[PDB]
Every structure is written in C-alpha cells, then in structure tokens.
Amino acid sequence: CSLDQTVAPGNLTLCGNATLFTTFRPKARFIAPEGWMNAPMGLYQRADGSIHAGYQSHPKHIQWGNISQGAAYSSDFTSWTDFNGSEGYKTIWPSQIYDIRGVFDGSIIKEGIDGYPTILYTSTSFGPLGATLNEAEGTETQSLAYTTDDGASWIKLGYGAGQNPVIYEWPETNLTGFRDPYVFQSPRLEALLANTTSITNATGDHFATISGGVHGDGARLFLYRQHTTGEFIKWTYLGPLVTTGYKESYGEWSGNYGINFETAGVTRLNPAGAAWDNGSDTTAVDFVTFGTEQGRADHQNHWPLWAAVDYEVRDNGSIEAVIAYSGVQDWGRSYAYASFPVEGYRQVSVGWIYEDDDNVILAKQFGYQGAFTLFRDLFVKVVENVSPSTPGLFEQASWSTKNSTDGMSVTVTTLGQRVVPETLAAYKGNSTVSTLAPVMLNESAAAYTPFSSQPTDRFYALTGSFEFGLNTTAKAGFRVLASEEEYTDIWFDPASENLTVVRTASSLIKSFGNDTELAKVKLYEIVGAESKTLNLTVFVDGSVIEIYANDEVALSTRAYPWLANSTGAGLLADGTTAGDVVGVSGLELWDGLVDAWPARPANTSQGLVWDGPTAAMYGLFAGY
Amino acid sequence: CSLDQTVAPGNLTLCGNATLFTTFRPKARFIAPEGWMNAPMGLYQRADGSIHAGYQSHPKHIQWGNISQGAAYSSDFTSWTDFNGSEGYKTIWPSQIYDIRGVFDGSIIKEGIDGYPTILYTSTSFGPLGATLNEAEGTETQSLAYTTDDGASWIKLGYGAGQNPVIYEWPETNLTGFRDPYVFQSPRLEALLANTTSITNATGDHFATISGGVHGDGARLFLYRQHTTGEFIKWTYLGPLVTTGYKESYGEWSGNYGINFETAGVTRLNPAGAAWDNGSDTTAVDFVTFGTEQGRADHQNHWPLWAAVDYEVRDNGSIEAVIAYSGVQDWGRSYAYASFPVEGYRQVSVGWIYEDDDNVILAKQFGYQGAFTLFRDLFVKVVENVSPSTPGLFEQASWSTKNSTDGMSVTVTTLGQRVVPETLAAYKGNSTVSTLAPVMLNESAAAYTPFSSQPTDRFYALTGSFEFGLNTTAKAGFRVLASEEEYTDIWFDPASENLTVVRTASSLIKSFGNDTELAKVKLYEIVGAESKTLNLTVFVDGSVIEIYANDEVALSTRAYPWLANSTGAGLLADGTTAGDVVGVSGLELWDGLVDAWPARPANTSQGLVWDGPTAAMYGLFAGY
Numbered sequence A, B: 001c002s003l004d005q006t007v008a009p010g011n012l013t014l015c016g017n018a019t020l021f022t023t024f025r026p027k028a029r030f031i032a033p034e035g036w037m038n039a040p041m042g043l044y045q046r047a048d049g050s051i052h053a054g055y056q057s058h059p060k061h062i063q064w065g066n067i068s069q070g071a072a073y074s075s076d077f078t079s080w081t082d083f084n085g086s087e088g089y090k091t092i093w094p095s096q097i098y099d100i101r102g103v104f105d106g107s108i109i110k111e112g113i114d115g116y117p118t119i120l121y122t123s124t125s126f127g128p129l130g131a132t133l134n135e136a137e138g139t140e141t142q143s144l145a146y147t148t149d150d151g152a153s154w155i156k157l158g159y160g161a162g163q164n165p166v167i168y169e170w171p172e173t174n175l176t177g178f179r180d181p182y183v184f185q186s187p188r189l190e191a192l193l194a195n196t197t198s199i200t201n202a203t204g205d206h207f208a209t210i211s212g213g214v215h216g217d218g219a220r221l222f223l224y225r226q227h228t229t230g231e232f233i234k235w236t237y238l239g240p241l242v243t244t245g246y247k248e249s250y251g252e253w254s255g256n257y258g259i260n261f262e263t264a265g266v267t268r269l270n271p272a273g274a275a276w277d278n279g280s281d282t283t284a285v286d287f288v289t290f291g292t293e294q295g296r297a298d299h300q301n302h303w304p305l306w307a308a309v310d311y312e313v314r315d316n317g318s319i320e321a322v323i324a325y326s327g328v329q330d331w332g333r334s335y336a337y338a339s340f341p342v343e344g345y346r347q348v349s350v351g352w353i354y355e356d357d358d359n360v361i362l363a364k365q366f367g368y369q370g371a372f373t374l375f376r377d378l379f380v381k382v383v384e385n386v387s388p389s390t391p392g393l394f395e396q397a398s399w400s401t402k403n404s405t406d407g408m409s410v411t412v413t414t415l416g417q418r419v420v421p422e423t424l425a426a427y428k429g430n431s432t433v434s435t436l437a438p439v440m441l442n443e444s445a446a447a448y449t450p451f452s453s454q455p456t457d458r459f460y461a462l463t464g465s466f467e468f469g470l471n472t473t474a475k476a477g478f479r480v481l482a483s484e485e486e487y488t489d490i491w492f493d494p495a496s497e498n499l500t501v502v503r504t505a506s507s508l509i510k511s512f513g514n515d516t517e518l519a520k521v522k523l524y525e526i527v528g529a530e531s532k533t534l535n536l537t538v539f540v541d542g543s544v545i546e547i548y549a550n551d552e553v554a555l556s557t558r559a560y561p562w563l564a565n566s567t568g569a570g571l572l573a574d575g576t577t578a579g580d581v582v583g584v585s586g587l588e589l590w591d592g593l594v595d596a597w598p599a600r601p602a603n604t605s606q607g608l609v610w611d612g613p614t615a616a617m618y619g620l621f622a623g624y
C-alpha cells in the first residue's frame, strides 16, 4: 500500500488497518479518539460552566455495536478534553440484562437522583430492534444513571421493581420504535396543563418525550410528565405530542416524515435564543426537532427535520402539538441532532456527520467513522420588510408570514441556526485570515477563479455575500478542496432556489459517494431592493464540508480527494454576463482553524478488533 | 402469621418473607447466606491447603436466575467463611454479552492464565436453553476467567476473536445441551493418546469434558484436549467420550440415562482414593460421574449417576468410554455432583440437595432454597471373600465380580463413598456423644423404640450396625425427627433389598413432599457367615436427612416437621420374632454437630426482591 499523494491512488483496500487514519480526518471539530461514533447524547452544561458532550461509541470497531457513551468536555464548545477512566473514554456501557444490547441515546436531568446530574437513556436488550422489524415490548426500555463526579463515571440504578428500567410499558401497541428520551423543563407546558392535573395526577417539573411510531401508520412523539417533583422513578404517559402519517410530506421545503422518529427534542425559542416564558412572550415559538426514518431514497434513509408547533390541550390532560410550519435542520449527510440549554438564554444544537463510504470499502483503513457537526445556536430568525412579490412567499412552507396593516410588507419568521460565536472567534483568532477584495462576476468571469490567497491544508473557512439580480439566471458559489484534477463545487442557482454540492470530481478514489447534495434556500426579497443576497459560509475540515446560508440553511457533506494539493479554493460563476452580474463581497479565508483536541496525538488509533464467530451467532452486531 | 410450634401450623402462606428462615434451616453444612442456590462449582484446593467452594447463586430471590458464582472457603470442609467483596458473597456474575443470561457451572485449571487459578465455565446468552427446547449454537459457550487473589475476585478474558468465549462451535449438530466444562489432568488418557497426537495435533496436559446430548438420540459427554501445554485459548474436540441411548437404562441398580447429561466429570480411583497412574495400577478404575435429565418421573426428572468405564482408543485419536458397570451416586433429592482432587491422593465429591417444595408454596417464607450434601471421599470399594450364593451377585449391575481360582469366593468392586473424615471428627468432637447399648429386636420389640438418650434439636447424627439372618423377612431401621404426631421412618427390608424413607407423617404441613424415597442396597454375603450386615449412618441437619449405607449407598432427602419437639429418634422394627431376630450394635448418637458458619448470625436474610414487569418481557428468569 502506497500512501503517495503526489500520484494516482492505488488499490487502497490492500492498505492495513488505520493506515489512512490522518489522511481525511477532521481536526477542528468534535470527533471520537478512534473507531465508530454516531449520535450525540447526554449533553449538558456542568456547574463549572463547561460543556459535557457524550456520544454513541464503539471503540476499536468501524461499524456500530455494543453501543456505549463516549465522553469529553470543553469550556468553549471548541477545544475538547477526553475523559479517561477504567474504560478509557467511555463512561457508560452495556452491563445489565436490561441494557446489554446497547446503551442508546439519552438526555440529562440536571438536578436528579440525590441532587446529582442524572441521565435518562434507552436501555436495550435482546430481540428484533428496528422500525422495519417486528419489535416486542421490553427490547427498548428507559433507565436512569447518575454521576457523583461531573461525568467521569455514572452509577446505574439497580435492576428490578421500582428501579431500572423506569419506563418499559409501550404507551400504544405495535410500535416501530421506543427510544431517545428527551428530558426538559417547560413553563409553557406546565401552564397549559395546570387545569388538568386532577385528571392525570402528574405534577412534576420535568417532561420527557420518547421517539417512535406505529406500524403502518406513521411516526409518533410520545409525551411523558414526571409524576412528582423531586422524584425520578415514576413518569406518567400523557399522550402523543406529534402524530404524522406514513411517509407523509409537508412538501419540497420539509423533507418527509417517514415511518418512525428518532432523537426528537422539544424547545421554545425567541429572536435572541432560548425562551423560558409560559406563553406570555408573543415573539416566542415552540419547536420540535426530530429525525425521521424510511422517508428518503438516499442519505441512509434519514431526514433531520424541525417543526414550529402550536400546542392544544386535550380533554384527557395531554398535549397535541399541531405543526404550523416544517423545515430541515441539515440537508446533507448528518442526522441525530440533539439540543440543550446553555447559560445566557441559549439553546445549542449539534448533530452527527456520517462518512460517505456506505459500502464500507475503506472504513478499516480509516480506523474510525463519523464526526459531529459544529455546535449551533438556535433562535427565531425574523426578517422584516419582506416584499410580497418574493416568489412563493405565501405558501409559508418552512416559515410563517405576517402582513403589515397596509398589506405592503411582510414579516417572515423561521428557525435560525448559526455556529456558536465561541467557535467562530477561536477559528478566526487562530487562523491566518485573508480579507479578499470584492469581485464583480460578469462577462469576463472564468468558470473558476482561485482566491488571491490560498489555503495551506484541508482546514479552513470561507465566507462571502453573493448579490444577485431579482430575475437572474446566473449561478455562483465556491469551489473547495481543489486541484486541477479534484475539486468540490458549491453552487447556488437563484432561479431554481437550489443550493447544490457537485461531487463528480471530489475524489480520484471511486468508492466514496459522488452524488449531488441539494438544499432549498428562500431568498426573502426586501421592500425597495433591486437585488437579493446569499450570505454563504463554508467550513472545510479534513473530509467535512459544512455549509451555512443566511443563518438558516445548513448542509453537511463529505469529500475525500487523494492528492496532497487538492486544498485550493475560489469563486464559481456560470452564465454571468455584462447584463446578468453577480457581486461578491465580504470575502474572507480563514486558513488553519483550531486544533480541537490539543492533548491528542495525530494518530489516536488503538488498532481494530474482530468479535469473532459468536457475533454472527448472537446476531446483534456486525462484529467489526 | 403465628410461629407457635407447640400447636398445629396455621396458614403459613400468610407469613412474611423470610419469617421461616431459621425454622427448618441446616446449620452443620455448606449453604448460601440466603436466597437461591443450586450446583457446586469452581471447586479447588488452594495453595494454602484450604478448600475453595463456589456455587450457583441468586441472592434475594427464591427461584433461579441471573445465575452467579457465590463462594466461600474452609480449612477442613466443615467450618466455612464467606468471601465478601463488592458483590457481597458473589465472585463471578453475568456482565458480558456472552454470559449475560447466566454464569453456569465451571471447573478449575489450577495453573492457568499467567500461572493463576483459572475457571473454565459455561457462559450463556440469549435464546431457548434446555434439553426439551430448540436451542441454537451460541446460547451456551465456554469462557475463561482467572483470579489473582485466591478466589476473592475473577478477571474474565476480553470478548472477541482469540479470547472469550474460547469454546463456541457445537461439536455435533442438534444438541440438547452444551455445558458444564470439567477440566482434569489424566496420565491415563495421555498414555492412551500418545500414539495418535499426529492425527489431532492436541498435546496439552489438560482435558475437558462438556455435557450434553443429541435431540432424539440420547445423552453425550464430549471430550476435548488442550491443544498445547501452557496455552489455554485453544481446546481441540477429540470425540464423544460417553454415548448413551434415549431414555436407556442399564437396570434397577442404575437409574436411567435420560436425554441429556449435566455436570459430568471424569476421574480415576483406587482402593485408597484418587489414582494418578497411567494404567499400570491393576487395582485402579476409571469412573465418570454425571447427572441425567428426563429419565425419571419424579425428583425433578433428575438422576445423579456414575459408571465404571473401560477406555478404547479410536482411529481418529479420540477415546470411547465403554460402560463396565453403572450405579447411582445418591438416590434422593440431590443432583449436580462435582468432584475435585485433594492433597493425599484424594478425590472429593459434593452435590446439591434441593428442597421438597416443588410448587413453591413456602419458598418466600423460607427466604432461601437449597444446600450442599456433605463432602465425600471417593474410592474403589473392594469386598473380599464374598459368597457366590449372594442373591443376584453375578448380574454385576453396579459392581464387578472376580472369581477366586477355585470358584468358591468372589471379590466385589464398586464405587465407594464416605463422608470426609475431617467432618466426622469435627461433628463427633463438638457433639454430646451417647454410646448406646446393643439391642436384640425380637418378639418383644415395639414398632418404635426411642433411644435411651435423645437429641436436643434438629442437628444430630446416628449410626448403627444391623445384623440380619440370611433368609430374614424382618425390617428394621431408624426413626428420626420424631414426636408422637410427626416422624420420618428410615427402613431397610433385606428381602426386597430396599432402603426406604417413609415420609407420610414427616410433617403436619401438607404442602411439602411426602413421597417415599427408595434406594437399592446389595448386602454382599461373606463366605462362612450366617448373617448379613447393614451399617447405617444418618445425618439430621435442620430439614436435611442424609443417609449412608456400607460406604456405598447414599440417600439425601427432606423433612419439615412443624412441632418444636419433633426431634426424637430411635429404632424401628417390623416382623421381628423369636426366630427372625435383628441385632443392632455400634449404636451412637452425636447430638449438636458443628456450627458450619460461625461468623454468620442465625438470620442472614437480606429480604427478597422482585425483578418487576420486565422479567416476563425478557422471558429468561422467573423474577423472584
């Protein structure tokens, strides 16, 4: 196996385990030391102000199995430190009959058992498990563990009656799934249910949703309420919070609701961030975020979605969350978004970016799979003075509209997402920053124009504001990870409203995915403006390309160019003329970003292992 | 719930958990501190000379489940001390995917992993498990753990390829069972296989048997050999050692071979005890001991058997153990006999005595289930100068015969069992000993004659030699645990060759078993003698009645009299006349025995617990 990145790649399947560990590996984001990772879990801000982040983890393997919580902490979302205990960087693992098949996703009760931070997690045991299989009651249950050392270790409650698992009865029959308990406090829901507590006897200050669905009849988000304040064993099922139809779609801007929900959460936001009012703040909006399964032909059959909801109180003392408008949290190769409260009235969200090696051709050669997205502040995005002539505006698909008194302007409201400012500040401060001159893309524009300053490696950020004519048919954007022979093209086409990532030339290595990514972007036209603007930021981090548009649209994807010099970047232009011009300003390159794991060496592989012939006998895990 | 033992018992099912803990509980033998126990396991003499005894254990429950190794140690087989660690008296428990369903029986490699004592045990996982069910490969595997602290704790090898479990492939298809690995060294088998090691490549100094059977085709004992000396991962299957037919019986003296073996072991004995020769000792005999399932209408469908075997070497470098004669290790309510080597050329055996409460009516009220038998030295019993006119002698059912040169006398050989002398010495020395005058039971004998000295509680031993006429039709024996209203009768009837325990009056409490126990006893008549003798020893220990006859026949059973004064004992006589007399001599009562657990208080209950609704969902354990 040759690792010569100045010539064409050979047969890389002949390479040994973890021989490509550093080749495509992100350096500026959250990632496990080695092996398999997927969903974020157990996210909380600790009493000292630091952030605890857990993740679904299978060390020394490159496929899912024995799924455990790996963990680390950070003071700024950006530079991280691994926990290191008796099980290395793991802090919760399968150990009891009720969770031996996997410690699935869970969330944090900040003041729980004996006042300690407490995780409510899906404990899995034997039997078919999946939305397309005939799952039985007991296979997925919900269990508690608490930490007396700020997340270095967790103590599970004992197995048995009145102890773990604490939630095991299916609330409705024939479930497709029953997992990912999301614990939260809600002055809003407490106020709404206050006149119904005689019906249910549930009066606790914590709620929990469990994600699932019903066979043949669509996804479900089940709402529970803590029965009594200060007591954590008894959780009372109120009713279904979100009910969607079998492979129902709200439209082109909204993905598809599939057959089963995963990793669903509930929050309330206002224009500044997190909202803690009871309903009295008229600017605040209730949101649900959730993954869906089997409503998509690609992207591992997975949509990470969100919806703004209006709560209605049922006669039986439960809540119906009626979808008002519905969108997509990320349009690319990411899933399993978790959100959590942070000091200063913030709600922060983070997801999992999977690889684009679905046939598992080079996974062993990597010696790892997966990374996190960047951490994102959620808020209510408000756009004022929107022109009613904005095409398709009143369809209100993933946004709401409110007319002015005179009907001549509109206020648009939607879900906002932006990278946490701690990360942006650290990235910019540690990078070599080049502020680039603005460019008019007209008849003289080449198809590709390299920036006047270039990156030095695969770790950089780009930003730019693209100003388009209201009736433009021109396309523009950014090319990244670019040499003459390999490059990844990020295009926006205002006429179609499509943001695409074309990956036909992303790599000489043909086993990686090369399909075109697509996001819809609505450019809300402002009253009196003769142009419309796309603010586009791109993070390039090893193989991750993470794109943000107008603090609204996110698209995470993967590119794995072989050649050492496939690091360049610049501007893309198509159909720009003397008449149809695209103006580009606010251009900056941040070269280098941040070393997110300063204590880790470059190669943190510990080798890979095989579970042996019994993996196939048990039939639970691939075994490698 | 009244505990007044001076009046009739009330409805004892209304009594609370462990309220009858001390009422019927043995005090002079090995028993768990509380809860469920069954099979002995992990038996070895430690480097300091003490005995380590493990047992199948489920604390705080009175039915089987989460089965673990409880453990204790003793310098003399008699007075014991519990281990006490992080899991109380447990030292191995379900903790990994491969053993989460139960840590079943296992045995000791004395110099194993890194030179430490090492247990090879049956690690069980999910799926149907049992001789009458459709078990699949993987559900029962064999795994290693080693101890660096003389049995206070055990470290399992890691899960995976080249590690645990170390034996997982079924050696033949459609097994009824695949468990209870019995590790042993055998100069005999090494010598026999020495010319075949090129065929198999197995040259290690340890052998292991695994107990099981084949569906519809009888029980099997599978022989493995350690592949290489000093290496413990690789064990090579040679072939079936013992093969018996579906519910085959060798006869009235031999129980029934059932459908499946459990807890089988292999040893070699001579007249003094254990034999370590290669075949050169002409007085030594090869033995297999084994439990059988589903060959019996009662006694939990379980026979604890043994067989003398003659080894034949197969062409494929394996051993066939051909049954020469076949007997019963204990005729009563015991099973799961394990044997192990002890210093001074001894092989010591011990089993499990279950309760006689099969409908589980008072198990919660007890707060425990089960005890061990006494520890027994095994040896080759040789009887010289046997008369050829001994009825049925030449059928050689559970014994062999060898004629003298002149054909006028016979040497009889069979399996001998006797209580270890350490226990007998301790029992006698700590007891109030009454040596009783000999008695002629004739026309003047009452049906029951109390001994001139009486026991003071339910903890005592009796011994006596009963001399019968060669053509007697009289019966005699011992009555124990006796008041006017409750008593247990132990009879020998030489005309039928039946030793019985009649339990119709054993207790006023009707939920306990009251069926008659039966053992066959051959009185080998000596040349020139005008009488035949039964030497009978009885241990009474709470509810245990353990009977030994002629260092050959053992019968363990249970009696649970309610009344406080149902402790008496004496002689039984039936059909004794002036002409048909039974002489009784060597009569002794040992009142008190020994406190086998001096550090334990009288009540070591920790309460009982319920596993909750998930027990039924998982379907593995009863849950209580």
Ligand SMILES: *[C@@H]1O[C@H](CO)[C@@H](O[C@@H]2O[C@H](CO)[C@@H](O[C@@H]3O[C@H](CO[C@H]4O[C@H](CO[C@H]5O[C@H](CO)[C@@H](O)[C@H](O)[C@@H]5O)[C@@H](O)[C@H](O[C@H]5O[C@H](CO)[C@@H](O)[C@H](O)[C@@H]5O)[C@@H]4O)[C@@H](O)[C@H](O[C@H]4O[C@H](CO)[C@@H](O)[C@H](O)[C@@H]4O[C@H]4O[C@H](CO)[C@@H](O)[C@H](O)[C@@H]4O[C@H]4O[C@H](CO)[C@@H](O)[C@H](O)[C@@H]4O)[C@@H]3O)[C@H](O)[C@H]2NC(C)=O)[C@H](O)[C@H]1NC(C)=O
Pocket: A092, A093, A095, A096, A097, A114, A154, A155, A156, A157, A158, A159, B066, B068, B086, B087, B090, B093, B094
């Ligand atoms: C099959 O069998 C297995 C094995 O038996 C079963 O698994 C066992 O199940 C039992 C019973 O549930 C568990 O016992 C509990 O243990 C926890 C502590 O767990 C932690 O610590 C253990 C011991 O640590 C020590 O030894 C280790 C090893 O040498 C060493 O590393 C360590 O440094 C230390 O020296 C660890 O072994 C254990 O690890 C295991 O579990 C981890 C996950 O938790 C896992 O990651 C590991 O890999 C490993 O598997 C873990 O770290 C005890 O806290 C708990 O005792 C509390 O709860 C019971 C009630 O059920 C109560 O009786 C006790 O009194 C106690 O409750 C008091 O304290 C609480 C905490 O402070 C408090 O909240 C309570 O309110 C209560 O407080 C009382 O006192 C205060 C005054 O102080 C007063 O104010 C209050 O009013 C009140 O009176 C149990 O003992 C075992 O941990 C577990 N073991 C394993 C190995 O799995 C399995 O369940 C069985 N399966 C089936 C199907 O049956």
Ligand SMILES: *[C@@H]1O[C@H](CO)[C@@H](O[C@@H]2O[C@H](CO)[C@@H](O[C@@H]3O[C@H](CO[C@H]4O[C@H](CO[C@H]5O[C@H](CO)[C@@H](O)[C@H](O)[C@@H]5O)[C@@H](O)[C@H](O[C@H]5O[C@H](CO)[C@@H](O)[C@H](O)[C@@H]5O)[C@@H]4O)[C@@H](O)[C@H](O[C@H]4O[C@H](CO)[C@@H](O)[C@H](O)[C@@H]4O[C@H]4O[C@H](CO)[C@@H](O)[C@H](O)[C@@H]4O[C@H]4O[C@H](CO)[C@@H](O)[C@H](O)[C@@H]4O)[C@@H]3O)[C@H](O)[C@H]2NC(C)=O)[C@H](O)[C@H]1NC(C)=O
Pocket: A066, A068, A086, A087, A090, A093, A094, B092, B093, B095, B096, B097, B114, B154, B155, B156, B157, B158, B159
């Ligand atoms: C799902 O995930 C779970 C969790 O990750 C998996 O379970 C884990 O699996 C791993 C991997 O197999 C195990 O790691 C091994 O651990 C043993 C030690 O185990 C004991 O000690 C652990 C740590 O103890 C410390 O912390 C605890 C807790 O705070 C504390 O109580 C204690 O005081 C101490 O401070 C215990 O946690 C562990 O308890 C667990 O297991 C018990 C049963 O064993 C159970 O009863 C408990 O309830 C609990 O569950 C236990 O007590 C290590 O010895 C071992 O490391 C050796 O082996 C590997 C090879 O695989 C090798 O890389 C290492 O270098 C090392 O081998 C060297 O040392 C050996 C021993 O001396 C020697 O024999 C070797 O030859 C080798 O020697 C080398 O060095 C010498 C020089 O010294 C040289 O001469 C030689 O040539 C050579 O170079 C592993 O690290 C985990 O224990 C296990 N954890 C749990 C909680 O279960 C699970 O398998 C996964 N499931 C699936 C399906 O994937």
Ligand SMILES: *[C@@H]1O[C@H](CO)[C@@H](O[C@@H]2O[C@H](CO)[C@@H](O[C@@H]3O[C@H](CO[C@H]4O[C@H](CO[C@H]5O[C@H](CO)[C@@H](O)[C@H](O)[C@@H]5O[C@H]5O[C@H](CO)[C@@H](O)[C@H](O)[C@@H]5O)[C@@H](O)[C@H](O[C@H]5O[C@H](CO)[C@@H](O)[C@H](O)[C@@H]5O)[C@@H]4O)[C@@H](O)[C@H](O[C@H]4O[C@H](CO)[C@@H](O)[C@H](O)[C@@H]4O[C@H]4O[C@H](CO)[C@@H](O)[C@H](O)[C@@H]4O)[C@@H]3O)[C@H](O)[C@H]2NC(C)=O)[C@H](O)[C@H]1NC(C)=O
Pocket: A161, A169, B017, B364, B607, B608, B609, B610, B624
């Ligand atoms: C002393 O030691 C003890 C440890 O041993 C310790 O703990 C106690 O342990 C004992 C066991 O030894 C525990 O006793 C058991 O308790 C169980 C639970 O009882 C509660 O739940 C029952 C079942 O609930 C389902 O069904 C109901 C009726 O259909 C519904 O109303 C429910 O909604 C629920 O339905 C859900 O689940 C279904 C599947 O199960 C599903 O189909 C359905 O769709 C839905 O999802 C209730 O029936 C029960 O209610 C009765 O009892 C309470 C309390 O007494 C009363 O207040 C009520 O009015 C009502 O009468 C409880 O709410 C029991 O299920 C279990 O019963 C079994 O065993 C007993 C005795 O043998 C039988 O009478 C019974 O028939 C059951 O037998 C079972 O076995 C057979 C075969 O052997 C099996 O085929 C059959 O189906 C069944 O499985 C048993 O009584 C006890 O709970 C523990 N108590 C604790 C932990 O506190 C104890 O504490 C120690 N003491 C001290 C002082 O320390």
Ligand SMILES: *[C@@H]1O[C@H](CO)[C@@H](O)[C@H](O)[C@H]1NC(C)=O
Pocket: A005, A006, A007, A483, A484, A485, A563, A565
């Ligand atoms: C980059 O490397 C390739 C392969 O060695 C080479 O052909 C090319 O000249 C280099 N420079 C570029 C594309 O700017």
Ligand SMILES: *[C@@H]1O[C@H](CO)[C@@H](O)[C@H](O)[C@H]1NC(C)=O
Pocket: A076, A078, A079, A425, A426, A427, A428, A429, A430, A594
């Ligand atoms: C570089 O990054 C670190 C880690 O995130 C951060 O704390 C530091 O402030 C950054 N340096 C700057 C902004 O100069």
Ligand SMILES: *[C@@H]1O[C@H](CO)[C@@H](O)[C@H](O)[C@H]1NC(C)=O
Pocket: B005, B006, B007, B483, B484, B485, B563, B565
């Ligand atoms: C034993 O106790 C019972 C019940 O109290 C009583 O009837 C009897 O007289 C006592 N003594 C005996 C049987 O010797």
Ligand SMILES: *[C@@H]1O[C@H](CO)[C@@H](O)[C@H](O)[C@H]1NC(C)=O
Pocket: B076, B078, B079, B425, B426, B427, B428, B429, B430, B594
């Ligand atoms: C009493 O029993 C103990 C424990 O078995 C034993 O060590 C001791 O020798 C006995 N006492 C005698 C024989 O006097």
Ligand SMILES: OC[C@H]1O[C@](O)(CO)[C@@H](O)[C@@H]1O
Pocket: A038, A039, A056, A067, A104, A105, A122, A179, A180, A262, A263, A335, A336
């Ligand atoms: O690893 C298991 C976890 O990952 C998810 O499937 C999301 O992709 C969760 O629903 C589950 O808790």
Ligand SMILES: OC[C@H]1O[C@](O)(CO)[C@@H](O)[C@@H]1O
Pocket: B038, B039, B056, B067, B104, B105, B122, B179, B180, B262, B263, B335, B336
């Ligand atoms: O508890 C399980 C153990 O008990 C037995 O069934 C004997 O009765 C063994 O075969 C097994 O190892």
Ligand SMILES: OCCc1ccc(O)c(O)c1
Pocket: A108, A109, A110, A111, A183, A184, A185, A186, A266, A267, A339, A340, A341
């Ligand atoms: O202890 C639960 C604290 C909490 C409050 C609000 C949330 O949205 C949440 O995820 C957790």
Ligand SMILES: OCCc1ccc(O)c(O)c1
Pocket: A111, A113, A114, A115, A116
């Ligand atoms: O279970 C009572 C112990 C406890 C101590 C401190 C707390 O803040 C708490 O909520 C509970």
Ligand SMILES: OCCc1ccc(O)c(O)c1
Pocket: A132, A133, A134, A135, A174, A215, A216
């Ligand atoms: O694999 C069949 C799973 C299944 C379970 C319940 C249903 O109602 C169904 O349609 C399918």
Ligand SMILES: OCCc1ccc(O)c(O)c1
Pocket: A161, A162, A163, B612, B613
């Ligand atoms: O379904 C379990 C019933 C139960 C509830 C609370 C307890 O403390 C208990 O022991 C059993």
Ligand SMILES: OCCc1ccc(O)c(O)c1
Pocket: A191, A278, A279, A280, A281
């Ligand atoms: O008194 C008004 C505060 C007010 C406005 C809206 C609400 O939903 C509420 O609970 C309180």
Ligand SMILES: OCCc1ccc(O)c(O)c1
Pocket: A271, A272, A379, A380, A381, A382, A383, A384, A416, A550, A551
């Ligand atoms: O809603 C106030 C915050 C906000 C952030 C980014 C935007 O693009 C916007 O229009 C509003």
Ligand SMILES: OCCc1ccc(O)c(O)c1
Pocket: A388, A390, A391, A392, A393, A394, A395, A396
């Ligand atoms: O064909 C799109 C129809 C139409 C025009 C303008 C809008 O704001 C709208 O909602 C629909």
